[PDB]
């Protein structure tokens, strides 16, 4: 049915942590203002991604029960979700309503950022698939939390411990889906289906970055840890 006092408490807590992220407007304003070379964009991307991972560790640490997890499992969850979380966030930013013509220019600018064509079409397919769901800020925050607390992640020693942490969050998202879109009973299923399409970007991220039309692919030491790059 409708959220319990405990669920409402958990939702507002997840929301506050989620909003500690760099504002969508701060990112789209920079892209839309002027066109940049592939070298300038690759640099914008690495700084964007470094800030994202830093803010992600802080959001993750605040997830109920995360700090009670085995420390090696804590790293495995972060390493396993960081790329997925960035693309989900990029999809969110992409689908924010902007003035007439703005989202067409944003799309065109990203399309010519330096990344190869073969990664452009799968990436915009996902962004636009996410857009059709017409997700709320609360749905994005919970889906990110659910992505991080994935028990079926590689190197996870205690899967049941992660299951126990993800289950209450899945219950809240399911309820929000019945509240926000009661005319679409498939909404919760669509969102979870979208998480499988997120997993595909996780396999091609290293290639996606190294295929960028730049002479040198320089990354920060933190990005070399979460991403499989040198």
């Amino acid at each position: 049915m409708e959220l319990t006092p405990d669920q409402q408490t958990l939702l507002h807590f997840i929301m506050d942590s989620y909003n500690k992220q760099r504002m969508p407007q701060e990112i789209t304003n920079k892209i839309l203002k002027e066109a940049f070379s592939a070298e300038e964009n690759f640099l914008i991307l690495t700084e964007m991604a470094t800030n994202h991972v830093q803010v992600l560790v802080e959001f993750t640490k605040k997830l109920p029960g995360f700090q009670t997890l085995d420390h090696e499992d804590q790293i495995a969850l972060l390493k396993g979700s960081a790329v997925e979380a960035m693309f989900l966030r990029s999809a969110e930013i992409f689908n924010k309503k902007l003035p007439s013509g703005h989202s067409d220019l944003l799309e065109a600018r990203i399309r010519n950022s330096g990344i190869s064509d073969e990664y452009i079409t799968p990436m915009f397919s996902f962004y636009k698939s996410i857009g059709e769901l017409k997700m709320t800020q609360e749905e994005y925050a919970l889906l990110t939390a659910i992505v991080i607390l994935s028990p079926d992640r590689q190197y996870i020693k205690d899967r049941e411990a992660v299951e126990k942490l993800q289950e209450p969050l899945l219950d809240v998202l399911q309820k929000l889906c019945k509240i926000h879109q009661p005319e679409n009973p498939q909404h919760f299923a669509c969102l979870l289906g979208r998480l499988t399409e997120l997993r595909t970007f996780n396999h091609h991220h290293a290639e996606m970055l190294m295929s960028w039309r730049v002479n040198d692919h320089k990354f920060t030491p933190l990005l070399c840890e979460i991403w499989d790059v040198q």
Partner: peptide, 11 residues
């Protein structure tokens, strides 16, 4: 080895 992730996780 992920000592930056480990550092960020434990303060």
């Amino acid at each position: 080895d992920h000592q930056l992730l480990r550092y960020l996780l434990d303060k």
